[PDB]
Amino acid sequence: LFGAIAGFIEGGWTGMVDGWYGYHHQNEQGSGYAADLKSTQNAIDKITNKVNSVIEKMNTQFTAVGKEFNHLEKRIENLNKKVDDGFLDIWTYNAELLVLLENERTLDYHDSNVKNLYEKVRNQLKNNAKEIGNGCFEFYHKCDNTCMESVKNGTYDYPKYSEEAKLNR
């Protein structure tokens, strides 16, 4: 558990309907939401591969389960019943445990994605921004939509705004 979903980020955004993770920006030009495309696409691909791995690993051949025995073959009938009951119990156990473990893994993966996005933004902004605490960064320098697109993409220019941020800090 990486401590972001229900951690320093206290809740989800219902207004963000276009992706799993992302950003909410507030500048003079206006507020808005925008999902991070790279992380969301990677997560979708990986989860799709997980679901496909679960599904297309449970292929079997043609089998007839029911067999019928007369009253002088009660032992063979009981043996058949034991075989079917054992297989049933084993497969029920496997299915339940698989779902239970993979659900934890998926939730932890989403926590890790949110945490990694937050840390990536933090490590590019450096001291040009102040960490409020709710997963939010307040800029020391006024910066427009080009700035926000750069920080979303991963191409933020620290030296371009370093001198401006030093005065306001």
Binding site: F62, A64, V65, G66, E68
Partner: protein, 53 residues
């Protein structure tokens, strides 16, 4: 007495391979075949009341 019968009738079956022959001999008490079934094996028997569509 079941089905108003005091005697019985045992039913037997066998499979005859290609090029093989089945021979019947009897002084009595024989219920002879009249129709035989040519079959090529191979997928189960399901007991259900469900209609077939």
């Amino acid at each position: 007495k079941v089905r108003d019968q005091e005697g019985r009738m045992n039913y037997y079956w066998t499979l005859v391979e290609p090029g093989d022959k089945i021979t019947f001999e009897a002084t009595g008490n024989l219920v002879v075949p009249r129709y035989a079934f040519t079959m090529e094996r191979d997928s189960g028997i399901i007991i259900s009341d469900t209609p077939v569509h």
